[PDB]
Amino acid sequence: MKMPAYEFWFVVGSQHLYGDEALAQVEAHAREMVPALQAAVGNAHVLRWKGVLKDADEIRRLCLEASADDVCAGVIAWMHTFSPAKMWIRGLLALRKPLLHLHTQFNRDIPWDTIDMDFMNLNQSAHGDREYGFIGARMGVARKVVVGHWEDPEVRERLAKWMRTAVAFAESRNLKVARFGDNMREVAVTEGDKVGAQIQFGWSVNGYGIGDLVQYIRDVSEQKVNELLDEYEELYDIVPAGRQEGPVRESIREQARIELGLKAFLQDGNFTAFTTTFEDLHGLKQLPGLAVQRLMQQGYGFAGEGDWKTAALLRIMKVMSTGLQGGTSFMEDYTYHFEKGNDLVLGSHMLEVCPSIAAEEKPILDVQHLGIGGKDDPARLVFDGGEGAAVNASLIDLGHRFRLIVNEVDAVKPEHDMPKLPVARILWKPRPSLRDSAEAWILAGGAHHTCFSFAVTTEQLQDFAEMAGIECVVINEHTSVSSFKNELKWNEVFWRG
Amino acid sequence: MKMPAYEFWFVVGSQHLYGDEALAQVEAHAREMVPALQAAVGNAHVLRWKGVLKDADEIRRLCLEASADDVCAGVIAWMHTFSPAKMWIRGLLALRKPLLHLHTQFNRDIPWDTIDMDFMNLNQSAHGDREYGFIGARMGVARKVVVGHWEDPEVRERLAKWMRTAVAFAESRNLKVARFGDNMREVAVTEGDKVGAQIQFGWSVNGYGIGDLVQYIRDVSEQKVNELLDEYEELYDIVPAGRQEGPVRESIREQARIELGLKAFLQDGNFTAFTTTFEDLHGLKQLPGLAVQRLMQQGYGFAGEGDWKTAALLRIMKVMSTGLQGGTSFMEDYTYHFEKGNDLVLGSHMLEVCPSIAAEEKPILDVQHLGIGGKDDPARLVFDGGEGAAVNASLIDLGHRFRLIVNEVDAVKPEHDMPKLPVARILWKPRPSLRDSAEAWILAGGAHHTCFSFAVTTEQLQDFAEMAGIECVVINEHTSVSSFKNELKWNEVFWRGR
Amino acid sequence: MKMPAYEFWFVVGSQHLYGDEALAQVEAHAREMVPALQAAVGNAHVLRWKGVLKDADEIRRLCLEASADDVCAGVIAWMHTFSPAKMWIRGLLALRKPLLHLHTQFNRDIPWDTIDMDFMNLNQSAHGDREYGFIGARMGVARKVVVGHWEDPEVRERLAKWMRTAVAFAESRNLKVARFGDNMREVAVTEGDKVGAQIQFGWSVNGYGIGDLVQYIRDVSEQKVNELLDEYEELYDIVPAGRQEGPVRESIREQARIELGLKAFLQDGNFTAFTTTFEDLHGLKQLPGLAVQRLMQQGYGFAGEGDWKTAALLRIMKVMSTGLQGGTSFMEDYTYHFEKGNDLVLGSHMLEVCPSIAAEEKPILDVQHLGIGGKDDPARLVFDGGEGAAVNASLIDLGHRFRLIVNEVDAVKPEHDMPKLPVARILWKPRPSLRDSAEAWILAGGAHHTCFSFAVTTEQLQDFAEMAGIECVVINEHTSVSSFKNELKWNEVFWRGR
């Protein structure tokens, strides 16, 4: 997936009171910082220099054009000198893209010997940013605040992380989701108000019949299915039974047909996420398995059993984790392992696990019996899950508002092999332990379908929740369950209304 | 300036159930305690013995008289034996002065040999104060609670500090502020709802024209300024350029004239705080600088750019220290020092920093170029800031309610001197560090004008906020940024319409 | 007075299901309606016909441009056929302009002979707008809803009123107010949160010193002052004492200087409303009187004693009263007349009554001793107020939110003359009576300064409050006071927190 290049407008605030001379000093400092801060991180995204802003009307024009530009994904604001905040009121009302408030100073030390009134009037960010911060508090605007020196490497790393989530938010705003079928019957976590989700996040989620998708698979070029079968054999290890032209190899060709038809449909409608349900497979030979795994590799959002929210959420987590070495997948929490030394959980799905979370071992393509769905034996990629720290998140619908639950876990490498299990799986230790992660997750109402990621941080998800105006609950190393209960109660009283 | 000398009514509660004989022992215990707490680092600070209260009408008469007496600055109540709390209901409704609930005991140990029913009927505060406590919670009255023995130095230290806070609150109740000019143009944090401020704290904030001040400076005694120059030369070190008669010497006498005229005007209207703006000086020669520093040392609250909130807060924070050393000043956060190891902050203003916060060096009188204001080069005191634990306070207006933000800092001594810097300055390390103190302060909506003090504690500011019915957020050594965000949200849910 | 010409984007909605052919009839009907809808009360403002919107991206781009174009002052939307409302969500999210929802039908009768499936697929507005209506309720966006046929005269007349108030709303967002001095001291209703007012309506209210204005009166060319004095003799009826060359004629020249300086400064800062206070007049010869009333006729908003809220309201009511009778003025309720048959009120100010509300008798230029202000005797216009139905409105600050109180009155012609009264005055009968309107007004917290106007209706003010998101209470003929109390109570619980 490629996305429209996004920009970030770097804006400095100032006054006319300190003279026409100081304005040149500010402009010079900013023209010095923006390209050097664009070196940093850097090349992935674009920092554009949008001038010094001194009057209310000038800044109002800026944030109105920012709200009109689809390429602008956020404004970074910094008060170099003292800018009076009432000028920013009329402006902040119109600006809708996310605001980063960069509280920095140009110089790093105070020149104790040669500091005069002119310097004290030029590099006074310490209270100008305080003024701006107050206006941001009194208007109640969603804002990230990053404090430090702009040459300090942690501030640069934080800027990169924020820009990543901001472009993910921009894609979320125009997000299209396609559902083939309906929900698994009587399932509650999968249900939500689509209209409320579009007013909150902007997701347009629409339901198509499965027949339209079968119709799209009818018009796929078979030359392409054989050429794609060649790429499968080059990338994955086909079972010897399926390396020759038997019945098991036609199931792989059938899954290639399904993938190409899904590609055609998703590309025609500008969809970035889709969902399928096993309860509605009238016209397909087999339940889509390998196809959805490859589409997840391509960058598409997916979730099973008709879960449009979790699919959308993984699409957003896919986009906010372009620190190339990602690792992101649809997940379900299947079973526990209660051994006192290493309490761990085995997670997977019926078929649809993305290979982004795999191990250096090349995944193996296999066909095996799947009785859930009542269809033909499906083809799937099988692999063990990698090892490292990760986060698994789920978005749920409380009825009047959304909740984002994120649990930091550590994925561990499997000690033993699992020979009779014919689906890809991953093993992890949740934090702060098994009993406390599970208890806290149940208390928060967490879903069973989860979005697992190696490259999304807790900061990124908290920042997305802040841009979207939704509660974010975090279960990590410091989470006590007794206090987590009261945290939930107080959050519910805050977010009501 | 000085204050109308406030007293504190000490009241002990009991009932008629245990007999008239026990009542005499209770009154005796209280008559023993009151003078001991009236020496005990008390005085100057007068504790009056307001009798034992046993009847509902007796109690309500007391708190009705207390709310009508302007000299009473607070009631301290202690339940010696079990006094039923419904008698206090009608009372607590009428009392409008700060309440300290002293949960104490007369004796220190249990006399294991001679304890009987008669002893258990005298010193049952352990549950009597619980009874009273419930009525304080169920009626929702603002009360401070101090637990311990009345000879414990911790209880005495907290009583003294609380009496300071209560007298500061009493001064806040009748606080008058005079504004010379308007707000600095499009500045938002300096602006606020005056009427909402009178209903919350009682501050009478009124704006006078700047010409009304010039009218007062014409009527100053011309040799009163010469008399003030002698005090200047005795206390401060004038630059040699100003020790004889030249252009530098006229600038010092003009600031002395400004000081004398301001004194006359502020005392004429019983004002205790005032504000000036550099945008409105259409009759003065120079922006008031030396004069403002002298008046802040005299005990007046001041803030620049029309900041009546910061000025009022400075006057009350000056008063809650009354007998300490003691520095307190109006301040603005001017520059950072990002030396990896030395998170440091340089704070000052254009001119108006109080010498109460200075070091031991006697301040220097100077004249230098001030480009903001367009007036004459003004004379001011310059000095380096002292070192010690300190507080940064700011009162802000969220629109429907006020917020008091308090940051604990440690002021450090300047290692190098700043020769070309023509303003007095102070250096501090904020807690828990600079980076996340700034982060949390921006998140909390803190103003740029801050009230700096060496002698005011966080306890005092929390207690003032408790008496005033306003949210108080404290950012100190234990303050984390992640939890600070959600704690702010929960505070907003509690204080929204309270 | 300038006022940038504003346009209104007219948008029709439908879908792609009914074909490229049905879309053509939709577009054809719309280009027939829009120019025909610009005939009717459409000469001040321009109705622009924007594309038919059928997909979410067209709607989003349209509503993004509408909120980005400064010339667009509002969108008029009509669902010709069934447009699914989810496509409209993101657009309504981005739209920051007033929305009028016109629920109409192209044809007026249904052709019983030729009605088939195609007719039911083309003119299904009756349910197409209902879908849209739900989203307007579900997102909680401010909406006017007008139902009827697009050739019906009442819908067109209501469209005119809404377009006037929408242009006034566009002017409110760019409203600048300049204050010469502060509020009248210790006056509470005139005080408010300026920052909250910029967040609610967009008013930028800033205070300049009166010396800044005196400087502008010093730099006015007196040649122009004499040229304006020449206009005075042609328009107004000067007192015999002042038609010759003496001291009484110099007061008119001084007010001409005041007018020229006020104009110069007000246009120098692009201000549209201003306030002056008599408690701060250091540097002016006389309290501004004639000048302020002439500038109020020019289209400026004014209020005395520093009343920026009433000043802004006067400008907004002046702008929505561009059709056209159309008197509008600053007001104060000075005295009652308790004659049990014609209970009426006499209203005016110290000097500052705008001649827009005058009668046809030519106003008289007069000078008399004015002790309020303590300055020289000022020149002023004197006249009696006209007659007709009118509204006097007041905007007040509840601390956490604003309230717009509107009382409909009937202005009466004076029966007796007022020879010794040296101020312009107006007499009116409030509804439903004097003693009942006064009770309702006191309960609603109405100010003493009121904005009185003959040409702005109650609907326009109700709709302005709806566009601004503020409570509007109306006191008219049907107002019972018993139920008026409860309306206030229920409104207070609804309006806390938005």
Ligand SMILES: [Mn+2]
């Ligand atoms: Mn399942």
Ligand SMILES: [Mn+2]
């Ligand atoms: Mn300042």
Ligand SMILES: [Mn+2]
């Ligand atoms: Mn008045």
Ligand code: NA
């Ligand atoms: Na499609």
Ligand code: NA
């Ligand atoms: Na006075």
Ligand code: NA
């Ligand atoms: Na100007």
